[PDB]
Amino acid sequence: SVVGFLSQRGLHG
Amino acid sequence: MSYNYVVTAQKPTAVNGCVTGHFTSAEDLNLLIAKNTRLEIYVVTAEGLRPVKEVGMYGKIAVMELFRPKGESKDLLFILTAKYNACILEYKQSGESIDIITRAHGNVQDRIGRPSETGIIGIIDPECRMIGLRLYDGLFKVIPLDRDNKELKAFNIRLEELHVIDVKFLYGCQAPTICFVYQDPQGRHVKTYEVSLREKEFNKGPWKQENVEAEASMVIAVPEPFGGAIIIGQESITYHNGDKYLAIAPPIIKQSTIVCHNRVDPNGSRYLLGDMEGRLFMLLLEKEEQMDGTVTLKDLRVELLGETSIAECLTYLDNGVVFVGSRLGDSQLVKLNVDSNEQGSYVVAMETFTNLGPIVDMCVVDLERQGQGQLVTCSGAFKEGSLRIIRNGIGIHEHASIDLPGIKGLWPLRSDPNRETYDTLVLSFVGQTRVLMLNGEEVEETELMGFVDDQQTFFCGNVAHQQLIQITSASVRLVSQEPKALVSEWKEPQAKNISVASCNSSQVVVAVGRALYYLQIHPQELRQISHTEMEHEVACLDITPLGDSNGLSPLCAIGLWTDISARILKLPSFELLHKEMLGGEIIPRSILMTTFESSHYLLCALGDGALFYFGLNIETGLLSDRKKVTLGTQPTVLRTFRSLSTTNVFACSDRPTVIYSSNHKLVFSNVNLKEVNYMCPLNSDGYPDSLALANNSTLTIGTIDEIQKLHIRTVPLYESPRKICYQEVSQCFGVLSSRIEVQDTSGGTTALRPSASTQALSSSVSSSKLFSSGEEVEVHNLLIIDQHTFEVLHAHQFLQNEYALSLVSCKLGKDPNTYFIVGTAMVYPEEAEPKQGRIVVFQYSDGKLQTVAEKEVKGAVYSMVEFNGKLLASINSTVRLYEWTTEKDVRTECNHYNNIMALYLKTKGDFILVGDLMRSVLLLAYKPMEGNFEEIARDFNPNWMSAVEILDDDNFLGAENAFNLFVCQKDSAATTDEERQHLQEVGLFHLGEFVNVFCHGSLVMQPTQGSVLFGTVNGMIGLVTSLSESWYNLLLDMQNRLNKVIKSVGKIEHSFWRSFHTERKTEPATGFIDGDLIESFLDISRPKMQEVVANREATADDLIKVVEELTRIH
């Protein structure tokens, strides 16, 4: 999901 | 012809890595903290962390190890950047100068190689023969270590295993032996090689390839007296070495993944373990013996210890203390104790370092509606989550306000020998003197015996021996607590006025011009001592018995007039030591001597606004450091105030300023006031720990905030904030939020801790029915935050499986209401991409959250700006422009479709829009035509954007996937049917940071145009301004001159650093300037500075001005 990646490619880990 | 300027405003605060060892001395314990491009070096102590050196680098630190080969006095530092700059540093203190030296360096990237899985890994063989590296799949670079190899020449070996998870060198190995876990089809396996460098291949590693678990991910390599390898999966942890295979499956850990580890005991019986959750483990290795035979291992276990911040980096130090590096939230210093406090937590926090975490979104706000902006940021993730308020300068809180158009001085005054408190404020005035008795907190002006009223007071300090002192123009008078009259009075033998005053709580030094007397406040009388005249007129004087001096004061200093100078002198003798012949035709208004903790200080203000401070010696008395300052445009007056434990020096100028303390240095921060003339500490019963401060007209009093150029306020969310608006008419913030939760035995979802959204004052939940048809999930809320108290006023919980992804606060259509709109989405792991979601309109009333209007949409609302009274909103791939009916509903007007996936949108007030996911960014007008969208232009590269902004009608900022910044404008070209449909990348730049947010704003004020701020995964807050071609060039040139002069740490090329860069393109930076670098200019010695010029005109110290007149841009 573009989500799972995309809201995490904030955290950055 | 694009020209911009970037500066750091806050260095990154996330801690990407951190190592311990002896890098300063063979005896000295150091903690190295790696941020992104900042290297922090502390010495651990009884207390904690003695900061010692802070270097930046021209790279993103990816690898960081300490190590020591044979015939080496102390540890050396290996550092590998993310653009593959290897280098080896050494700690070099030339007595007082500190330096980090580059022992070797070279760039180790390869033309081949697609960068692997788990990204870069560097490792070092214990015997220090070499450095092993994984950068690409299939290869394994090796940098052999020799006295030379000063250019870190390395060779790759080939690696059968195309997918390695983690790797370390093993201990107790004859030949350099690696050990690694890798995944192929089946599952994961653990393999070993030797590494012979002679023939450069591998050979066979000590033991058979075994299996490991599906999610084995960490590899620990146990030191000598045990050897072997520790392997960490989920729910399970194992040990391997030759034939030996020890394993455990403690349900305790199944709950979360281990993520970081750290040896405690050199021998390695104990190890720390970090957790996605914040949990801290002890991993124990139970030894076991036999006589003439070494030590096996019988078992191993896990013992929960408690809870840290979420740890990336984790490092045992001195006794039971542990540094805990966190990127998701605040890094902290932590004590492990033998016993568990309340709740069974063998863990106690000692210190706590502010990490602006991931800055996921942010915005500006003048809270106290002034003229400066504060900044408010969503930060952290999960429990570390939170909001942080950020304010430039040091502010003060005003109690009384007496407008006195004159006040030409002021000193304290108690009227009772007991209390530490004062009750009068005597104040030099427009050729007069008034007094101010207080009922405590109340204003009143009367009289005191032996203190002239028509004579202008020059001083008032608190002289011991039960007496009160008034130096006036004419006489240096004397009064008592006992007698309280004309106790004494010194008059100049000639009828000549006092020029400069200087009373100490025991001594007295006046000046009559070039004339210098000296008197003493001995029991109830003024006895005289020395006389000495000087070359020229006495400009200013100060005396304060420094450290080892009860009342009576050692040597001194004095500003003169015509020659323009300051000079070092003793006491009743008046003997000149050293002196500085400063320039100009303007004199020193102010000279000061001081102390802080570990030093004695001399400072000197001039009439222009600039300062020079230098370092004194209560013993020797010589020069120090020559580095003029900026400060006000008006004569600065220096006085000392009461604060914490290390009391400080306040600078009165038009630009009021404090002088605090850095590492052992001195902070130089703004104070948030209009203008300050004179100022002093205070304590009265009615105005305690206060400071007094006058201006053109007004006396004020109050306390003082933190220190730093930035003060930072924080509101723990306990969950993971996502977006943030400011509905000002409601005096509050709206915030998108998210907590995790787990499946139940009942099926439904619990939670795992109280959150900002569960502890909410009131609360709602979506009723809406637009849809029909262990285990973790997110639960999302809008939140309403009082802008004054920062309380979760209200909470709206969204649907089961809805993410709220966008948030705005605006007025719409004709409608006079200010709403809170929220784009959402129905997310599921089986869907690669959501096809359901909704826009929702909300209002905040008295304390009420009205669900005004929903609006189902066939995708995920990725973002949405208020347009021109209408509502613009990216839906999944479509870009749509909604209208508000007078019937209060959201209905379409038009939509653009030519998007791979619209993620970001912004608006050039007029009818101009912009943005995309994996393309670069487009440009769109709306048309008062048939009310249509027209796609003006785009940019054909392919940048996975993260953040977008508009600087002006032509200028488009972009941040993206690969820590690059870039700018676009549109072509000024004939044939406007292609040369127009395309817009060129006129600025490129590598920031080295991942940007989540741009916004217009600024932190300062009540050369450069515009001001956009940005926020990064790493804690960094930078700023982008626009420039004039000329200013560009003045600065471009000056970048190049400057680079030649500065020795870069890992001998890395600044321009290599800043070079736009992807996994398929590397251009040098055009049209960008880091002040970051330009600011370096100021840290340079005048020698190295003159150099920067051999050449409208060209000076030598002209630029030193320009460069200050820049810093002050944030």
UniProtKB/Swiss-Prot annotation, chain A:
Superkingdom in the source lineage: Eukaryota
Coiled coil: none
Tissue: Ubiquitous.
Chain's role: Is a substrate receptor for the CUL4-DDB1 E3 ubiquitin-protein ligase complex (CRL4). The complex CRL4-DCAF5 is involved in the ubiquitination of a set of methylated non-histone proteins, including SOX2, DNMT1 and E2F1.
Quaternary structure annotation from Swiss-Prot or TrEMBL: Interacts with DDB1, CUL4A or CUL4B. Interacts with L3MBTL3. Interacts with DNMT1. Interacts with E2F1. Interacts with SOX2.
Name this protein carries in UniProt: DDB1- and CUL4-associated factor 5
Lineage: Eukaryota, Metazoa, Chordata, Craniata, Vertebrata
From Swiss-Prot, chain B:
Effect the entry attributes to changing residue 561 to A: Strongly impairs interaction with CUL4A
Effect listed in the UniProt record for changing residue 537 to A: Slightly impairs interaction with CUL4A
Region described as WD repeat beta-propeller A: 13-356
SUPFAM superfamilies the UniProt entry points to: WD40 repeat-like
Modified residues (Phosphothreonine): 1099
Subcellular location(s) of the protein: Cytoplasm; Nucleus
GO cellular component: chromosome, telomeric region; Cul4-RING E3 ubiquitin ligase complex; Cul4A-RING E3 ubiquitin ligase complex; Cul4B-RING E3 ubiquitin ligase complex; cytoplasm; extracellular exosome; extracellular space; nucleolus
Region (WD repeat beta-propeller B), start-end ranges: 392-708
Keyword Cytoplasm: yes
Modification after translation: Phosphorylated by ABL1.
Keywords: Acetylation, Biological rhythms, Cytoplasm, Disease variant, DNA damage, DNA repair, DNA-binding, Host-virus interaction, Intellectual disability, Isopeptide bond, Nucleus, Phosphoprotein, Repeat, Ubl conjugation, Ubl conjugation pathway
Modified residues (N6-acetyllysine): 1051
GO molecular function, one term: cullin family protein binding
Domain of life of the source: Eukaryota
Region annotation Interaction with CDT1 and CUL4A: where it falls in the sequence: 771-1114
Residue positions, PTM N-acetylserine: 2
Swiss-Prot/TrEMBL GO biological process terms: apoptotic process; biological process involved in interaction with symbiont; cellular response to UV; DNA damage response; DNA repair; ectopic germ cell programmed cell death; epigenetic programming in the zygotic pronuclei; negative regulation of apoptotic process
Similarity remark: Belongs to the DDB1 family.
Notes concerning its domains: The core of the protein consists of three WD40 beta-propeller domains.
Known role: Protein, which is both involved in DNA repair and protein ubiquitination, as part of the UV-DDB complex and DCX (DDB1-CUL4-X-box) complexes, respectively. Core component of the UV-DDB complex (UV-damaged DNA-binding protein complex), a complex that recognizes UV-induced DNA damage and recruit proteins of the nucleotide excision repair pathway (the NER pathway) to initiate DNA repair. The UV-DDB complex preferentially binds to cyclobutane pyrimidine dimers (CPD), 6-4 photoproducts (6-4 PP), apurinic sites and short mismatches.
Disease connection: White-Kernohan syndrome: An autosomal dominant disorder characterized by global developmental delay, variably impaired intellectual development, hypotonia, and characteristic facial features. Some patients may have genitourinary and skeletal abnormalities.
The protein's name in its UniProt record: DNA damage-binding protein 1
UniProt source species: Homo sapiens (Human)
Lineage of origin: Eukaryota, Metazoa, Chordata, Craniata, Vertebrata
Gene it is expressed from: DDB1
